Amino acid sequence: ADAVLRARAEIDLAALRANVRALRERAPGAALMAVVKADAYGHGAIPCARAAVAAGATWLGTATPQEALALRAAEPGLPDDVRIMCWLWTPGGPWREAVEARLDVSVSAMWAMEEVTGAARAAGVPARVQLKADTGLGRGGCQPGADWERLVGAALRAEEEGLLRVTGLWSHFACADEPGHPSIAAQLTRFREMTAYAEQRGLRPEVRHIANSPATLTLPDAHFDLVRPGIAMYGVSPSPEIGTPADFGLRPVMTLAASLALVKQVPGGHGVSYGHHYTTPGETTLGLVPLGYADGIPRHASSSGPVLVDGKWRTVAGRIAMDQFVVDLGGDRPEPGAEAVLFGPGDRGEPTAEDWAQAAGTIAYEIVTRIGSRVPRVYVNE
Amino acid sequence: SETTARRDADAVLRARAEIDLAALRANVRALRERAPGAALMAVVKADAYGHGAIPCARAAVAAGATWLGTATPQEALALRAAEPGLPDDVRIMCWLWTPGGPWREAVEARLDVSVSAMWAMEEVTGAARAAGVPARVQLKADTGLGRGGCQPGADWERLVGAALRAEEEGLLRVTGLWSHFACADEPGHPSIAAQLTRFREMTAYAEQRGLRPEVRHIANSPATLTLPDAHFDLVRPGIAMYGVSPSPEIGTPADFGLRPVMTLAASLALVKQVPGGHGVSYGHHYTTPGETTLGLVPLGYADGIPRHASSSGPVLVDGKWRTVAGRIAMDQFVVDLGGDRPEPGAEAVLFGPGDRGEPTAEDWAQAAGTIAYEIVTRIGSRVPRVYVNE
Ligand SMILES: *Cc1c(COP(=O)(O)O)cnc(C)c1O
Ligand SMILES: *Cc1c(COP(=O)(O)O)cnc(C)c1O
Ligand code: NA
Numbered sequence: 001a002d003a004v005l006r007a008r009a010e011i012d013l014a015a016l017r018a019n020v021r022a023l024r025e026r027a028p029g030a031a032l033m034a035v036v037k038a039d040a041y042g043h044g045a046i047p048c049a050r051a052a053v054a055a056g057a058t059w060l061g062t063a064t065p066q067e068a069l070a071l072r073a074a075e076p077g078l079p080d081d082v083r084i085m086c087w088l089w090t091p092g093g094p095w096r097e098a099v100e101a102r103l104d105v106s107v108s109a110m111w112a113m114e115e116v117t118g119a120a121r122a123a124g125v126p127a128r129v130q131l132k133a134d135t136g137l138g139r140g141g142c143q144p145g146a147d148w149e150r151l152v153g154a155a156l157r158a159e160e161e162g163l164l165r166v167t168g169l170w171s172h173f174a175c176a177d178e179p180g181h182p183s184i185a186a187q188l189t190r191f192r193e194m195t196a197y198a199e200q201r202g203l204r205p206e207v208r209h210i211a212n213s214p215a216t217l218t219l220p221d222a223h224f225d226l227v228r229p230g231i232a233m234y235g236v237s238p239s240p241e242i243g244t245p246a247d248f249g250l251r252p253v254m255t256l257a258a259s260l261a262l263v264k265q266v267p268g269g270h271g272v273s274y275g276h277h278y279t280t281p282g283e284t285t286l287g288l289v290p291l292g293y294a295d296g297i298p299r300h301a302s303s304s305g306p307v308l309v310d311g312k313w314r315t316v317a318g319r320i321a322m323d324q325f326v327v328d329l330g331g332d333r334p335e336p337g338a339e340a341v342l343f344g345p346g347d348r349g350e351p352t353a354e355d356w357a358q359a360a361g362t363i364a365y366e367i368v369t370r371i372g373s374r375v376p377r378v379y380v381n382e
Numbered sequence: 383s384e385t386t387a388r389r390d391a392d393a394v395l396r397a398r399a400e401i402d403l404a405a406l407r408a409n410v411r412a413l414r415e416r417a418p419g420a421a422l423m424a425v426v427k428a429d430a431y432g433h434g435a436i437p438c439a440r441a442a443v444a445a446g447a448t449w450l451g452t453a454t455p456q457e458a459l460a461l462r463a464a465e466p467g468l469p470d471d472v473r474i475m476c477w478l479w480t481p482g483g484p485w486r487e488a489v490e491a492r493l494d495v496s497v498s499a500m501w502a503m504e505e506v507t508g509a510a511r512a513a514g515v516p517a518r519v520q521l522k523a524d525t526g527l528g529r530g531g532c533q534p535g536a537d538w539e540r541l542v543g544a545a546l547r548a549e550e551e552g553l554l555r556v557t558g559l560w561s562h563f564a565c566a567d568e569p570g571h572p573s574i575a576a577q578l579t580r581f582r583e584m585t586a587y588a589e590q591r592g593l594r595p596e597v598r599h600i601a602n603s604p605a606t607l608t609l610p611d612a613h614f615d616l617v618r619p620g621i622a623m624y625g626v627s628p629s630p631e632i633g634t635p636a637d638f639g640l641r642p643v644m645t646l647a648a649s650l651a652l653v654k655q656v657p658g659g660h661g662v663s664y665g666h667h668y669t670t671p672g673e674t675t676l677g678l679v680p681l682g683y684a685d686g687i688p689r690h691a692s693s694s695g696p697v698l699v700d701g702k703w704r705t706v707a708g709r710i711a712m713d714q715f716v717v718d719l720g721g722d723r724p725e726p727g728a729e730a731v732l733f734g735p736g737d738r739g740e741p742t743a744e745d746w747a748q749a750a751g752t753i754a755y756e757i758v759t760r761i762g763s764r765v766p767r768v769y770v771n772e
């Protein structure tokens with residue numbers, strides 16, 4: 001009750017559920033994976049995972065093995081039949097703990113194939129392995145040609161020894177948020193080639209999957225067996241080029257709000273905040289919003305971030321500080337403690353995360369994900 | 383336990399922020415030398431600017447800091463509650479208050495609390511009345527920053543008057559008068575003198591009316607480093623304590639006898655050969671110019687690697703500086719290794735003090751169009767801190 005007075009990030013789990021339902025409707029031939037990496041994109045890993053699973057997600061996706069292990073360890077437990085996949089591995093990571101926790105683990109390289117095979121051997125339980133194909137993104141993923149040939153061969157031998165099963169073949173798009181970008185078709189072609197190859201050699205995955213949010217929303221031919229619509233599950237559109245949340249029956253899950261710390265009159269010609277990059281044009285009132293870049297308010301939104309205060313959109317006045325920023329209230333005199341709504345779903349006349357993204361020269365994914373740990377999350381409709 | 387040690391040893395494999403507390407102690411000594419007339423406050427807000435509030439507070443107190451500074455009352459209360467405790471005689475100040483906050487709990491914990499406004503004067507006086515123990519109040523003057531303090535003139539007249547009435551009722555003592563600079567990182571900016579002149583005037587007024595503060599203070603890091611006339615009784619050199627210079631205009635850390643406290647490093651997750659004409663990362667903003675090797679660094683913007691440093695952020699890998707290739711993702715980014723074939727798991731050093739040929743937080747600030755304060759402070763909770771020289 002006390003930390004929330006300054007500020008809070010309200011997480012509407014009924015919105016999250018509604019988004020999962022909308023995404024399931026949009027991808028009727030596929031299972032839906034709830035991507036809950038990075039503390040569920042800043043929304044809270046476990047509560048969001050629970051909600052998504054209640055709304056019909058049958059897979060959970062995380063980056064690190066620690067994130068996936070925390071899901072498995074949650075109490076009360078998520079259903080034991082939910083598949084949990086993690087993909088960001090480094091040498092010497094906790095492969096054995098993952099295998100014992102029945103996680104689907106991604107493998108993009110021989111080193112990881114060797115480590116997971118060794119861990120399955122030492123645990124006496126077979127691993128569930130997803131082979132990642134680099135189809136054109138040039139990040140994670142095994143390259144086509146000899147690398148893929150070798151990896152597929154090593155996977156087959158490990159299957160032959162009862163040490164694992166390849167449960168999936170997957171990849172990830174570079175440019176799916178730009179509809180008609182040529183790389184999209186090129187990646188889908190290479191994905192079909194590489195998965196056809198793996199299956200010809202003998203692998204029998206349960207799932208094949210490539211689609212992130214923008215592909216889920218715009219490319220039914222990319223749905224395959226499983227879709228991974230991360231940002232959309234949080235009700236945020238991947239890009240204005242793809243559309244608005246409303247275009248897809250989505251509703252932003254996070255509302256970020258604060259309580260004014262100070263409301264004061266100042267003369268004209270008064271500088272505001274570091275460097276004095278704003279100067280009051282005449283006698284006015286200033287409002288102090290007690291969130292700053294340590295809380296995830298991006299310093300790049302200096303002079304531009306929008307905030308609903310006392311019935312009107314205000315903008316940041318000058319530089320955002322570590323813990324606070326100022327707005328010029330133009331003579332209005334809300335009371336101290338009055339609500340300042342930085343972003344939300346938008347139906348109360350407040351800004352959206354996408355407005356902040358534009359103000360900060362970034363994408364809405366970065367805005368929601370990097371809301372700081374100093375801001376308490378308040379869960380509604382759990 | 384062995385199960386807890388293996389868990390810790392496990393998260394550090396991907397990445398870590400190494401926090402050298404001997405560097406922090408050295409910085410505190412350097413800053414105390416620089417401000418010989420004043421007590422030093424260790425500003426440990428925002429989880430010690432991303433370094434860890436309690437360990438950094440302890441190290442700063444060991445090195446001679448006699449005040450700790452935090453933004454929120456919750457941060458200040460957490461310092462008081464630390465076990466083993468910090469010395470009971472260290473003063474802890476907090477300044478970022480909102481209506482209905484825990485004034486009574488702060489008064490009972492003997493915190494110095496900042497007040498900029500009549501609402502807060504009323505709330506803290508009420509809390510002191512309910513607790514039956516006097517509050518320690520610092521009045522903040524708005525001397526020109528236009529953020530948190532009380533405006534000169536009638537507002538300050540009213541606030542000083544209210545404080546005097548509260549003192550007369552035994553409900554508080556005004557233990558400080560303070561302010562904060564707008565432009566101290568820009569030496570010779572005319573606002574600096576303007577603020578100091580206003581500060582002197584407002585504090586003189588308060589004392590003329592009867593207030594007797596223990597400390598007057600206005601100096602942040604760049605004022606501490608450059609403006610001895612601003613030291614007054616107490617200095618608050620936040621970023622410098624962490625070894626980071628407030629701006630290249632002020633100077634380098636080495637110019638002030640400072641050393642960066644944080645080193646951010648990761649272990650490569652993948653090293654692979656790719657052909658020429660291969661796009662790299664979202665939007666394909668980088669395309670390989672010929673056959674090359676790519677290295678995957680398993681940190682991304684969820685870990686505090688700013689997305690603005692896409693195509694520019696520097697990283698030491700396998701003996702050379704590399705730059706981010708294309709877009710930084712949520713959890714990873716790629717570098718073009720130009721054919722080099724380090725081992726998976728090899729160390730990628732993003733920033734540190736710079737003596738091992740690695741970049742500094744200032745290099746990332748420039749890459750990302752920001753200030754080094756933002757770089758260190760926003761390193762994500764998903765990156766474990768490893769404390770050395772406790
Ligand atoms: C982060 C992530 C996703 C989800 O991406 P969105 O754009 O948020 O839908 C899908 N797959 C992988 C591998 C990811 O890393
Ligand atoms: C953050 C802060 C400081 C320290 O600022 P630096 O530039 O890091 O030294 C000093 N005082 C106050 C009130 C602050 O909020
Ligand atoms: Na790919």
Ligand code: NA
Binds near residue numbers: 272273321
């Ligand atoms: Na501001």
Ligand code: NA
Binds near residue numbers: 423424426621623
């Ligand atoms: Na300090």
Ligand code: NA
Binds near residue numbers: 523525526528561
């Ligand atoms: Na000021």
